[PDB]
From a paper:
Eukaryotic [name] is a 32-kDa homodimeric metalloenzyme containing Cu and Zn ions at the active site in the active state. The protomer of [name] forms an eight-stranded Greek-key β-barrel fold with four conserved cysteine residues and three long loops (loops IV, VI, and VII). The Cu and Zn ions are bound at the active site by loop IV, whose conformation is stabilized by the highly conserved intramolecular disulfide bond between Cys57 in loop IV and Cys146 in 8th β-strand (β8). Eukaryotic Cu, Zn-superoxide dismutase ([name]) is primarily responsible for cytotoxic filament formation in amyotrophic lateral sclerosis ([name]) neurons.
The wild-type [name] structure was determined at 2.7 Å resolution, which contained twelve molecules and two partial models in the asymmetric unit. The twelve [name] protomers were organized in a honeycomb arrangement with a large space, as previously observed. Interestingly, the partial and indeterminate models occupied the large space between the honeycomb arrangement with the highly diffused 2Fo-Fc electron density maps, reflecting the structural flexibility of [name]. Thus, our findings showed that both the wild-type [name] protein is dimeric regardless of disulfide bond between Cys57 and Cys146, unlike the monomeric C57D/C146D mutant [name] protein.
Author numbering:
A (entry chain B), B (entry chain A): 1 to 153
The structure:
Amino acid sequence: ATKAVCVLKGDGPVQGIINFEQKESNGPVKVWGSIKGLTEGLHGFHVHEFGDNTAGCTSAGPHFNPLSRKHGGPKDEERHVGDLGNVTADKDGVADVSIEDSVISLSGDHCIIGRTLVVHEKADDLGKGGNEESTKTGNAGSRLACGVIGIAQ
Amino acid sequence: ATKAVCVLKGDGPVQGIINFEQKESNGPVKVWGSIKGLTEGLHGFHVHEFGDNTAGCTSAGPHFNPLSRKHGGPKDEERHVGDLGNVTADKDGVADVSIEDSVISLSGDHCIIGRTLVVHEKADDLGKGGNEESTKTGNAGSRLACGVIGIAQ
Ligand SMILES: [Cu+2]
Ligand SMILES: [Zn+2]
Ligand SMILES: [Zn+2]
């Protein structure tokens, strides 16, 4: 199988460990982990294009969009490859992530290993906000934490 | 992939920025950058296997060796893929990086993207130290700083 781990770190109390798993070259990737230091509610969850940490989470660039599409939901027809939707944090700010996506990959041209996974400040409207920013970032807000996706054991 | 990036950080004072450029899929990778906070002398510079920073640079794993060989220099036949050799820091502790390695690669079977780049405490004997650790890590010492090699623009 193929595994991957991401160490989410930020300037504030936002930090978490996100794990990935793909048992086949075309199989769905299982995203699970726990993030702390988040406001109670929904938070953006997207994989950005570049695995750059030279200027914090800003150097990661926009969302992973190899097909040159518009931002949307994970189960929507129009979406970026790195669009994973929202992650919900409880009252204690703990976000026990559990996402099963069939669009992202751990090997190939649309692979996410070597890029940046980012948890955002606000919620993702999944490209339904009605503005231009909904079809680019989903109005998810600023980047609280980020980390370079890497190969794990 | 033709460009990569790796931000070096640790629990101590060592920190730096390393860039990778591989214009040809079968050409050498230009590794250049600058690291600071080191001791004046030679320090280990190897690419480890796992891009795992959950437990620090310890979870990074051993040196990247997909051919199952022994530790050596960068211009040696018997060497791990990540065995880039040593780096020299000046009297102020700044080590200007400039390595051209054809064994590593930004794509393919020898892909270092998604793995980690680890700097070390002491010098690397290139497998000629005289002990058992010489053929594994080269007596490079503790991992001072590490980071996941990410895709760059
Ligand atoms: Cu090493
Ligand atoms: Zn998007
Ligand atoms: Zn080695």
